[PDB]
Every structure is written in C-alpha cells, then in structure tokens.
Please model this.
Amino acid sequence: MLNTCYRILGLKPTVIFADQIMYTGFAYAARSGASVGIDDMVIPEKKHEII
Amino acid sequence: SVTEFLKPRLVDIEQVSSTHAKVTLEPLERGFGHTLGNALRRILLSSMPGCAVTEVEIDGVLHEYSTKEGVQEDILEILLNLKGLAVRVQGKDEVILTLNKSGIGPVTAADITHDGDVEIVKPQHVICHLTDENASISMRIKVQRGRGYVPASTRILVDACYSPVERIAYNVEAARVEQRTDLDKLVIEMETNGTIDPEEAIRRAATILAEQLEAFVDLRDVR
Amino acid sequence: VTEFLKPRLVDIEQVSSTHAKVTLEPLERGFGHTLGNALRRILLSSMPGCAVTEVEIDGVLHEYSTKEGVQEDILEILLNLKGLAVRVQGKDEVILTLNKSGIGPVTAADITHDGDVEIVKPQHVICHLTDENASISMRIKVQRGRGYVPASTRIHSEEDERPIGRLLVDACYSPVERIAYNVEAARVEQRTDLDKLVIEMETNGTIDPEEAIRRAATILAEQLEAFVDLRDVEFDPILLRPVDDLELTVRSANCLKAEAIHYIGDLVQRTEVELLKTPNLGKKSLTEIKDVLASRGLSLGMRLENWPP
Amino acid sequence: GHIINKGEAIGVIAAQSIGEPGTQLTMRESSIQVKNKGSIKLSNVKSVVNSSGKLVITSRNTELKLIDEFGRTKESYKVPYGAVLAK
Amino acid sequence: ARVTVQDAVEKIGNRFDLVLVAARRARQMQVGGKDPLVPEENDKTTVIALREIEEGLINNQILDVRERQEQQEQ
Amino acid sequence: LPVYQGETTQTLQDYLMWQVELTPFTDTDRAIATSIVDAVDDTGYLTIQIEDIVDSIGDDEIGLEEVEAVLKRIQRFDPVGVAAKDLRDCLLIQLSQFAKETPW
Amino acid sequence: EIKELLKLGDLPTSGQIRLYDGRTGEQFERPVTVGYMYMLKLNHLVDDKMHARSTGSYSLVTQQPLGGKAQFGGQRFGEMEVWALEAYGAAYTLQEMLTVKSDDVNGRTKMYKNIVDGNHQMEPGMPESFNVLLKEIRSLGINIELED
Amino acid sequence: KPLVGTGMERAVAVDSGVTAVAKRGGVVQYVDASRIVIKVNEDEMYPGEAGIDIYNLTKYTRSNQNTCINQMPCVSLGEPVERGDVLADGPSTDLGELAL
Amino acid sequence: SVITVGPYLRLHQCGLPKKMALELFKPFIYGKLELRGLATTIKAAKKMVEREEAVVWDILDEVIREHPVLLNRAPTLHRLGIQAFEPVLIEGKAIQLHPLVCAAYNADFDGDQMAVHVPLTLEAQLEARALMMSTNNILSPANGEPIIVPSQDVVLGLYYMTRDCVNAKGEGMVLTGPKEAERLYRSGLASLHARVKVRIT
Amino acid sequence: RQMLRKATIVNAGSSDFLEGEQVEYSRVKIANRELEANGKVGATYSRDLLGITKASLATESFISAASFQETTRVLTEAAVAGKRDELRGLKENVIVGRLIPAGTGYAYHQDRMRRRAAG
Model:
C-alpha cells in the first residue's frame, strides 16, 4: 500500500499516509488491548498419541 | 495557587468551509484536556437535538427487494440518499412530506412540497436517481423530533439520525505557559451535516452539559 | 433538551471512617458513564489536600544519620510523617510541636493539640524509642496544596533561608488516591428506563465525600464556562537613559540636537565611517565622545533589532 | 525517480551496502526431475551411434533446457557424456 | 517549517546546484542589502530562500543577472 | 599516551583576548587593543606607561586620547578593572560600577 | 496448581480481567491479564549518561578536545560516519566537521565571532594535525613538503 | 520481599556476609539504630567473660560502586534470639531474604 | 544522548531535551541576546545564560525553531546511519526518536546512546535539509525497497481493526462511510462488523 | 571493476618496457599515440585482476592507501621513487581538509580543475 502510494501519488502523500497509518495503529493497538495468557496457546491433544 | 485554575483565552477557530471547522485552545491544566475533549465529544454525539427523516412509504411493495419500474436505482440507495438530508422544522411536530416531478431525471430536494416550518438546507441534494421516462413516483416520507441516534432495527424504517453532526474528533498536545511544559492543549475537529454552525453546536453542547451538571453544586458560587 | 430531568444528590452513605459511597438521581441515557469518568478524573487530578512541608529537629542535623535512643532511622521517620493524615482550619501554613520521652510507643495522640488542627488517625507510628534517657523533640510544618509537589520544586523559594537543621520532605496533597464508579438501571417506572451512577470512594479522612464531589462539580462548571462563549477568532533595552550627563564639551550637544539623535541607543549603533558623514566635529572630539561611549558600551558596539517608543 | 546525476560518489554508495548485512554464518547424472512440459534443447550435443534406440554423447559440455510455450526455460540439468537420450 | 523539498528539486533537477543557489541566496539575505521577494511568515532566511527558489523566481541565472546589473550600476 | 592530557588552559591574558574578538572596533582599535592587553600582569595592572604604548604604535595618527578610549573600553571587561596602570583608579573603577543606593 | 490457587483468593482461573480506559471511560475488549512482577532498577541511569558541550579546553598535541566526558569533553566522529556523510554528498558539512569543529585554531574563533555576529560563514584554512603529521614525518630522514 | 521466589535467596543472603547475625546469643537487652547488644544465656556462656555480645551496624558508607550500604535492625525490644539468626538487614534484604 | 519512543512528534521532528539544549546553541543564544538588546556586554549575556532566565528559554525556542539538527547512531553500517530531524524541546534528559526511523538506525529501545550534531553554516543546514532528512530517505539505496515500513504494534492494530469473526453487532447496518466511526464510538456496531454496505467514493 | 586494473603488457608499444601499468592510463596513452601520430605502434596488454587487499595499495597517490594496511613501506617506496599525490582521492582532501570532489563540492572541484588550466 505504501509502495503504491509513493509510486502513484508522490513523496509528501506517502509520508503523510505513513504518519496517519502509524497514528491509527498506535490508537487501535491500545484500544484493542491485545493481551496474552497461558490458556491463549493450545497444546494439541493428539501430541500424547504421536509421541 | 490554592484554588486558582487556568482558563483558556485563545479560542481562535479556523474553518475551511461552512460545515468543517478546526478549533484550538490554549495550554490548559494537567489532565483536563482529554477529560473535557471526551466529555464534549460524547455529549455532542450521544445526545443532541435536531430533526431528521424516520421512515418513508413509497408506492409499491413494502419489502426491500422491490423493482425499479422506471427508477433505475434500488430502493436501498434511495433510502441511503434520504438519510443524507438535513430537514429543519421550526416548531412543528412529526409531519408528513411528499414529492412529485416530471421525467427529466434530476430529482432534488426542491421536488418536495414546501411547508411552513419545513425547510431544507441544500435544495440540490439528490433524492432519486435519473429516471428513464416520464413516469412519476410518490415518496410519502415523514419526519419526527428526537435527540441522539437510534437505528431502525429496534425503533421503526430507514433510520433515525437526530444528531445534527457528521464526525467529531479531539487531540491533545503538550504546551508550556512560562517555564513548566506539562500543560495540555486541546484541538477539536467536528464536521457538521448542516443547519448548525460548528461553534454554535459546541456552545449548545457545553450549555447542555452545564445545565445537566449545575444541579450537583447545589447553587454554588453565589458571590 | 425535551425535559432532560437533571439529577440531584441524595442518599449519601458512609461505610467507614475512610470509605464512603455516594449515589445520585436517575438521568438521561449516555450521561452516567461520561459523568462518572469526568468526576473521577477531576477528583484524582486536582483536589485540595493537606500535607507536611518541612520538619526541623534539634537532635539530628541531616537525614543520613541516626539518633541515640531511636530504632528507626530519620528517613523512616520522614516517610511515616509523610503518610500522616490531619485536617486544618481557615489559616494555612501551621506549625505544631512533638516532644516525648520514655520507652513507650509515640503516636499521633501525644502531640500538642491546637484549636485549628485535628488528627483523624491517632494510632499512627512515629518510630518509637528504645532507651529511657532518650527524648525526641521536633516541629512539624503542615500546609495545604492541590497536587503532588516534590522537594526539588520548593528549593528556589528558599535561598537565604533553610539553615542547617531543617529537612524538607515530599507532599502528596491528594486525600482520595482511590475511587471507582458504576452505572446501573433502577428507581424509575412512570417514565422511560433511566440510569443511576454510584461512586465508591476511599479517602484518607481529611475531606468529606459530599464536599469533594461539590468541589469537583464546581471545578468542572468553571472549566466548561469557557466553551460557552467562543470568541477571539515589557521587553526593552535596559540602557534607556537620556542623552544628558554625557559630557558634551563644545559642539557635541549641538550635533546631537541638530541630527535629532535619540537618548542612548541610536548613537551606539553607528560606525565611524558613517558617523563622519555628519557635520565635521573633528577627530579629537570624535575620540573624546567615543571614550565616554566606550566607558559604558564597549566602543559603540551594538546592533538593536527594534526600537520601541 | 530519475537517472543518477553527476557528482554523486557511486563508490561510496557501493562497497557499503554489500557488507552492511552482517548476518552471515561462521564455523561452516541419473536423478532428473522436470517441473512442467518442456523440450530437450541439447545446445550442441555431439550425437553418436548408441547400442539401443538412442544417440550417444561424446562432448563434455552438455546443457539441456525445457521449452513450454516460449523462449523461457525452466532448468539446465547438466549431464555427463555418459547420458543416454530416452526421448 | 518546510517538511519536504521537492519543488525546488524539480526547478533545479541536478539536486546539487540547488544547495549552492540556496546558500548564495541565504548568505546575501542574512548579510543584508536584499529583500525577500516572497512574503515571510516568521521564518529564517534558509527556508525563505528555499521557498522562493521552489516558487520559480530564484535560480543560477536571475541571481547572476541581478548581480551584474548591480555591479554595472555603480 | 602521546599527549596524555595536555589540556590547554585559560590564562587571563588569553581570556582578555577572547572578549577582544567579540568586541566590535576597527583594525587600528584592534591593533592597539592587542598592544594594551599584551602588556598586562598576572595581578592585572598594566606594566608599561600609556605614553610608552604610543611609542610601540609608531604611528603619527595615533594619539593619547585615542588610546585613552580603546583602553577604557577594554578596561571594564572580565574581571572588573583590570589593565589599571597604577591602582588608585583601579579601585575607582570597581567603585564606579555598583549602585548609588549603598551608603557611604 | 496455579489455577487452583486462584480459586482460593476469589480470582479468575484463566487469569484475564476486564480493564477500562483512564481517558475515555470505555471498556476494553480482549481482557488484559494483570499480575505482579518483581522489577529491579539497573545502574545504567540517565543522570550520568547525558553529556553536552559547545566549547571547552583542547589538548596541546594535535589540538583535539578532551573526549569522553573527561573534564567537559565531547563525542568522537567515526570513519563509518564520514563514509555515511560521503554517501549523502555533503562536502560543506564535511569541511565544517574538518575545520570548524576541529583542531583548526585560526578557524574556531572566527566561526564563534561569525555566529555571535550572525554571519554564518566558514573559513577552513588548514588543520593543525596535518602540520603535526608533516613534522613527525620530517623527524626522520624523509623530505616532504607541499608545492603550489 | 519478592512474592515469587525459589528459596535460595535466604542462603544467598545469609552466606554473602552482607548482614549482621547473632552468634552465641540468648536474648536482647537494648536495641539502637546502629548498635545491638545481646546477653548470652548461661547455657552457651563460658567463664572468664562478662557475657555480652555487641554488633555495630554500618550506616551510610561509600561502596566501590558509589552505592550506599546501610543496615536496618529487626528486633524491637527483648526478643529471644537463637544461634544463627539474623539481627540486621543489609542492602536489598528483608528478614534475611535477598530482595532487590 | 539516550533514545526513547516518539509516538507523537512525526517523522520530520526529534525531541531534543532542554537540558542538553541551550548549551549546543550557546553561541547562537549570545548572538540573539546581543541583537535584541538584552545584553550590552558578552559578560552580561553569559551571566544571563548561566542563570537560566525565562527570556533565555524564549530566545532558545525562537532560534532552535527554524534550525535543523542531525542524529547518528554509534554503530553505523549504511548511509541511513546518520539522518537529520527538526529539534523539539522536551522536558527530559533523553532524545525521543521516531519509531519508523528506528528501523533505519536499527535501535531496539534498550540501553543505547545516540550522537547529536548541530550545523552552524547555512550550507550545512541546506545539505541536512535537502539530503539528510528522514522525509527523503524513503526507498533504500541498496535494493530499492522502502525503508519506512511498519512492523510493530501498528500492524497488529490494523489487522485487528480490519477483520470480522462471523458477524458483529449490527450486521445488516448500511451507512455511507463517515458514519462508521460515529456508530463505533458511541453504540450501534463494532469494528468486526461484517456485511456492512457503504458507498465508497 | 575496482579489482580489475593494473594490466600488465608484453609488447613494448613505445610506452614503457616495464610492468605495472594501469588500464585507464595505458588506454589514454594508446588512444593519444595510435590515432594521433603513429598507429602501427600497438601496445598489447593483459588485464590481470588483483585482490582487494592488494589492489587497494596500488594507487598513484602516496597519501591514500597508507592508513589502510601499512604506512612505513608505502612511505619508503614513495621516498625512494619520489612520487606526487596531487590530491585527487577523497582521503587526500579529507586529510588536507578541503571540499571533496563529490556531492555539493563537485562543482567547486570542477571549477578549480578548469581554473588550473590557464593559471
């Protein structure tokens, strides 16, 4: 997306685009939470049989 | 010092058009920037008086999967265009409107019958697409009074966009008064659908918040 | 508006001496969350409290040493005094005394009590002593503030003051330090379903819940009063003395008056090659004037940007 | 987005981008599999008489190439002189 | 402040003579005797000279012509 | 290590010239100035007579009044009244500087 | 066992918990797992790392400034750095880094004067280190000089 | 003190010789911010001595790393302390446990 | 100079701490004090700067405003090891580097140190603005791919906000496009809402 | 390319009865000798590549290619042969402290080179 924006539009457009994309990403990565935990990853039950 | 707070004196507002305006403030107190921005945004977005269209009754089948029969456009796009109409009622209650035009093709807001208190901000807004022949059509729309926003799934047919706003956002920057740089500078950006000045809408929302909060101080600051 | 039915205050509850729960009247939809959030942020951002500012003691000199007869060091004494909760009256900047001897526990009750100072928790610890011949005697200065202020902020205010023996501490000026809110749906039938917000706070005992809520609401009102009316769309050179007392020998005053020379600055921001364009005064008089001008301005060295009237 | 102008030092641009990715490592004739449809393209292989119904090879420089629809090739598959043409 | 410098590059092309022209213009603008043909906006001589060049009024020819005219007018 | 530390230092006379450089003046004023502050002690009063300095210039144009000027310009530099030419007046210069408000 | 221990203190066995925003008062989705980690502060603090300089004392040999914060020193420029500079084609910046901020004695004072006066003009001259190298080469039986 | 440990911190703290422990002691008589005295019982006491042990703490002394090595006491007044029990708490220690 | 994260402070900017500032530009502060008639002597300007008056900070903000600076990582392998940015005063002791530029500098926000350089001559400032600015080194000088490419939390946030489990709240909802944020912020639908019809221009 | 220089010759070609001639130098020499005056005198050359650590030292300027590997041997060879640097390389101008002939200083360098023709 950024490469095509640079190619088609120009330098200033792709720069301001990258800036707005980074702003929106910083906002949504904090509004979404994106947590981690033990039960997040799942161990397959078939592993005990394959071993 | 003890109870002295900083009040914004720089309220310069620059606007590009009559519906878009970017307002900025001066360095405020610590933590008040985001609080005030969120409060004002939620007040002006979740509950705001204004008029809007609620439902239409077009001649044909009440179901959505209808036919064109000369309209050349699906009724879904017709309702989508009808949502983008800022009708203003001076004092009257829920009222009915209708329209009738020839087969020229350009269907605008001027085709609706003119009433006493019913007004349209832009008479060039598209209501129906380009017709194919001289066939006419009746809209039979109605408008109601309300505040805020509520979809048509729960409260019936097209939608209920009583809020006379289009988009609202707020940002907070760092600023210094004389030496300390831990001051907040609020920047509001609100695109309005029409019929209400952005600064006027901000003033109305602030007055609404004040009159909703003034009962908590129990008549403070008498003198 | 359409009958926004603004809420009211009612049913103020007091769970304990430092934990309370306040309730309001039902309000319109979409108001409880924002109201609770704004009230919490204001109560946690700027609320007037009372803390300790500076402590003096005859026994010890600095805070990096100990005292014969005490168990805990001076730093622990200061950290315990920082957490001391006490409310004060109309006048601010108060100073109390604490003197006690023995081996028993020294608490906040055995302090000289004045009519304008009230302790809310006399069971605090002041680093009790261990020896019999030990006797502590100090003075605690209690002031009031609004926000957290460290010890480095109040250094510039004391340059000739603060002798050897007085140790300053950190002040918090925040008596709540913890609060929460919750919105639910109750107490309204004859009309549409409304919502009520309850606020559970845990203060330190210095300030009252109702008073704090009223203060927060008044601050919010005063702050929002500025958005109701949207509008609005010294430095000078020190050397400004007049042209007098410049020792105009013969014709220097006449040349200054004829050329409409200003007081001081305009004559300084001139070069000799450009000064020779003036009526002939002579090299001797030029050097005589340049000496007097250099005695105060380093040989006419200056290039001013602007000139205020 | 334009051609390089005069005065720029290519030698400084070069010899710096090659050694920049310093993420390398340290301390250390019968099986023929074709991908798609192709041709032989012996590329000047000396053809000699063979025992079976094929052609023998005497040159040491042999290189094949597969042609599906155009001049584009798929692989080389260099074989020794002891190769026997099966097709 | 000026974010991106592309118009002056298109006016020069060589990407190297632009710096020399902007420097020889800003030197004069800072030392005095010249007046910015572009209305300033509380900016230093460097960005002013660069924007005047990107606007299409200052280059390696007009400056030399003006210097020769000023030297011959003495 | 070849230069070890070799920290070149201030030196007073060296300090006097650093402000000579950013004082504004002409070539003749900068020439006399180098002459004057050339001839100045660790204590700070000047070694040679002022009429001597005129003989060091060797210029008909140069005059005592001109010298009185460049000298006094650099006479209140850093620190206060330095290049004294026989203390009495050095004291008088430091008096000179501070406010009327102090008694006596 | 960890999950069973979370049940005795009235806590969720999964370990997740809902959190609100301290600036918008909105509930976050995807509940964030909170905990209590043992944190330790390192000696690498910012109070000693920072070091600035504009003009200080130089050395007698090669006339270079002191260096790594030793009595108000300054940082060092590198070979990879001048290579990177030449990659940009900044000849004037390089000359400034070679004469202005360097051992050039007859240039530092002049640059200071031009900056205080607001001239912004550079006079390169010649570094003293080249003269030191010439003298050290002439100290042996090898003649060396510069022509015109 | 840490909430998630291994148990080895106790041994690391008592073995590092960074604190002050009670050797051949039976009971404490006087406690001070920089002085500790212990009256040994007659069980572990041999004749020819008064029968008291003294420990002088280290208060705010410069270390090699320009840090501060300060010892805090544990007992308050008249506490029966056995042999091999800690008395003071060195830098980053809590009740004989390594806590940094 | 110590590196920190610049969430704000967009590409053509860098956070220069005011404690490290007012020292590098001291020869410019002296000049600005002599020009504005705030110090008749050099000694007076030095005394006013060593005391850190408010006018000193004002002059500093006025002069450093239109004056670029350049940063350089100590391990520099390629051309992008030295870049130029606009200095902005931050009340701290660590320079804030832009996240997207961190890819070029190869920093990882651990214990690191950054070198700063101030240009005095006009030609050096022009070379830093026209050649060494971050707003010009988009593509790489080795292969051609763009250097500025998001890989961090931004990518995860975009991937999360552009998704749909099966159908979130308000599936059948139809809008114009500017109403999406309006219905997401207050109530009506979530970001994971699918089958939403909108007119894109 | 940088590795491909210093081509040896087998035929005289009236250029030099020696070994160790650069490719560009020999090419300019043969282009100035053959087409101008005598084309029958052809100088056949053999381009033998050298390693980086070996081709680096093969420079006409004694200033450069000194700090790279060894300084003493290069200095002795330059003192024995008596060669001039003329400051053509980047490192030469770097050590001397002038504008390098690259980037913004390339115009200044070209002007200085053009000015050295007349005087």
User: Anything to note?
Assistant: Chains D and H do not touch (no CB pair under 8 Å). The first strand of chain D starts at residue 47 and ends at 49. Strands of chain D lie at 47-49, 55-57. Chain D has one helix and two strands.
